[PDB]
């Protein structure tokens, strides 16, 4: 869940669309006050940092060793595992029995060839048994596995559809409420501008009438001065 409580006066469904030129001016300015404002690395709104691998109770030392190996590998995507002896798993050839080879050594390497042949025989027999089992009872298992997998697909699909319906609901309801508020603010802003213009014109006309009433005040003052001089 988000933890930011900073409130902007941004109402996108009713505010006019910002043009790209003064938009780019806005990121340019935000960048320059970001340059002058120092960055806080220990800000409380920042989540705690990712702990390193060594002190974590999760990863075993084998896992840090493998992570270090794959990190030291220059191409992590092409990093591969030390493969087993598939050359030894392959079918054996007839060994070359040398005449100068001793009987014990020849018997020992024939024994090793026999070991490999018997291991391959048992492996191939198990493979054939599993192949026959898959022939006789594999199609229904494949069907039920695909059916379960597409059932999980349906579950994820209905979850995403429910979230999208939540988004659609929120967007439409706030379109309505924002539009009502935007009509209100548009009315108040136009009324404020018209009132400013009207009061400026009003005080201009009142200042002009103040000029004539001061003219008549001076006229009465001059008349009183003339009457006092003549009397």
């Amino acid at each position: 869940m988000p933890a930011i409580t900073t409130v902007h006066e941004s109402l996108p469904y009713i505010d006019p669309e910002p043009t790209p030129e003064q938009r780019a001016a806005a990121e340019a300015l935000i960048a320059e006050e970001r340059a002058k404002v120092p960055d806080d690395p220990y800000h409380a709104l920042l989540p705690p940092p990712l702990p390193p691998l060594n002190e974590s109770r999760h990863l075993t030392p084998i896992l840090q060793n493998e992570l270090a190996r794959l990190a030291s590998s220059p191409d992590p995507q092409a990093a591969k595992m030390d493969a087993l002896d598939f050359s030894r798993y392959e079918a054996p050839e007839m060994p070359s029995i040398d005449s100068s080879q001793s009987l014990e050594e020849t018997a020992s390497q024939l024994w090793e060839t026999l070991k490999q042949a018997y291991t391959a025989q048992a492996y191939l027999s198990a493979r054939r048994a599993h192949l026959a089992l898959l022939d006789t009872h594999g199609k229904n298992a494949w069907l039920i596995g695909n059916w379960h997998l597409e059932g999980e697909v349906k579950a994820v699909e209905k979850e995403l559809a429910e979230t999208k319906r939540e988004i659609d609901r929120v967007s439409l309801a706030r379109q309505g409420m924002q539009e009502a508020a935007g009509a209100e603010l548009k009315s108040l802003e136009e009324t404020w501008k018209a009132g400013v213009g009207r009061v400026l014109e009003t005080e201009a006309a009142a200042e002009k009438l103040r000029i004539e009433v001061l003219e008549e005040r001076r006229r009465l003052a001059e008349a009183q001065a003339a009457l006092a001089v003549g009397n």
Binding site: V7, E9, L11, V199, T202, A206, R210, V213, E216
Partner: protein, 48 residues
């Protein structure tokens, strides 16, 4: 959305206060107009 709800609210009080002050100052402008008009009519009465 919660943030925008509070933003809309505070924008209503801000703009309502601004337009109310402008209209009150307009009313004071008409009061000043009435006072100066009464003074002008009084000077018309004194001259005539």
């Amino acid at each position: 959305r919660a943030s925008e709800e509070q933003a809309i609210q505070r924008r209503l009080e801000a703009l309502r206060a601004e337009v109310a002050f402008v209209s009150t100052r307009e009313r004071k402008a008409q009061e000043l107009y009435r006072k100066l008009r009464d003074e002008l009519e009084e000077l018309r009465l004194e001259q005539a």
